Amino acid sequence: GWVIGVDPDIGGAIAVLSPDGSSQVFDNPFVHIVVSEVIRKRLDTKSIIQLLRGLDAPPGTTAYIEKSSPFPTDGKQGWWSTGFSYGLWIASLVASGFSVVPIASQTWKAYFGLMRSETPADDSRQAASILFPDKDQSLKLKKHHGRAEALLLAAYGKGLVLP
Amino acid sequence: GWVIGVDPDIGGAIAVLSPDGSSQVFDNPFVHIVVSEVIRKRLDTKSIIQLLRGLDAPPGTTAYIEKSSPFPTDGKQGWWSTGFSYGLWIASLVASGFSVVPIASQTWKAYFGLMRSETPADDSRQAASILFPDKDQSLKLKKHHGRAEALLLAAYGKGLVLP
DNA sequence: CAATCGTGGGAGACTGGTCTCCCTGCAGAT
DNA sequence: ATCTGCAGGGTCTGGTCCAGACC
DNA sequence: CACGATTG
Ligand SMILES: [Mn+2]
Ligand SMILES: [Mn+2]
Ligand SMILES: [Mn+2]
Ligand SMILES: [Mn+2]
Hints:
Chains A, B: One of its GO terms (molecular function) is metal ion binding. Chain A has helices spanning about 45-55, 75-95, 105-110, 120-130, 145-160, and strands at about 5, 15, 25, 30-35, 40-45, 60-65, 100-105.
């Protein structure tokens, strides 16, 4: 009963669920780098691999990762970034011994009843708070939706249900 | 002593230069996958990590990889792929214990005097044929320019010079 | 299979149709 | 530090920005 | 560079 969930974007997170029901969630490590004479956030490859190497989850644990699906109206830098983040995470997960299962955002949203909300990020945090009450304090900021998404991905993969 | 050169695109390659002067070059592994009801080529994450595991190059060996730099006129799918291929390779290389150094294409081209050619692919293969004569049969086809690019990147890292 | 060409493009889940979904990169306000 | 709003965008290297190059 | 063709 080990499951990993990964929201791969720059404000994303990785959640780890263990057989005893406990949970962990880590913000995606990033660094500030210079691109075309401005500052950009990019995921921190070496920190991600060290994080994955430090997990207690055994080899073969399944990691559910949100499928990249940039909108056609998103700009070309958005497409590059979502592609880059996805490839960095997939390779790090495979290299660390995990079985990687891409999941569409539509799949886990429909599973928890979060399709077509007016406030989708607030709702994600509320749903994750109910599934993981001991994470309640770690979900109270609006910027914490990435943590919520990672936890709901993992919850999906484990088959948890809302009460 | 040991140097790795990576041309990360879908027709790219990885070259490995041993201290005894011998060289190897491998085509980037890929699979065919379905995206939006059409077939696409995508780099094969599992094969890439197995290839890196099988190399004799010791940990800490430097891997030179061409920096991603898509043109603004390239479409958003081009930006996504070059982003994805770059992230996949960088994470694979770090996870396998290699030290990663991104090199702009302008840098290794100017170093071998290949700037501003009317036939840049052909010239790359000729330059790599001269630097690595035992790879001459592996460079006869025009689609082998990715092999040439990987070898030239590695040659740049090693400080080799054309005669 | 290997080469060449022209243009720059969503993708996904539930016999095609339909409808839903992610961001990045800046800026400014507090 | 945190939130919100709007539009969708190159980046790099050699030599105080410019110029010219590249996938 | 990708992508989706077409040409021997
Ligand atoms: Mn997400
Ligand atoms: Mn997210
Ligand atoms: Mn290249
Ligand atoms: Mn290439």
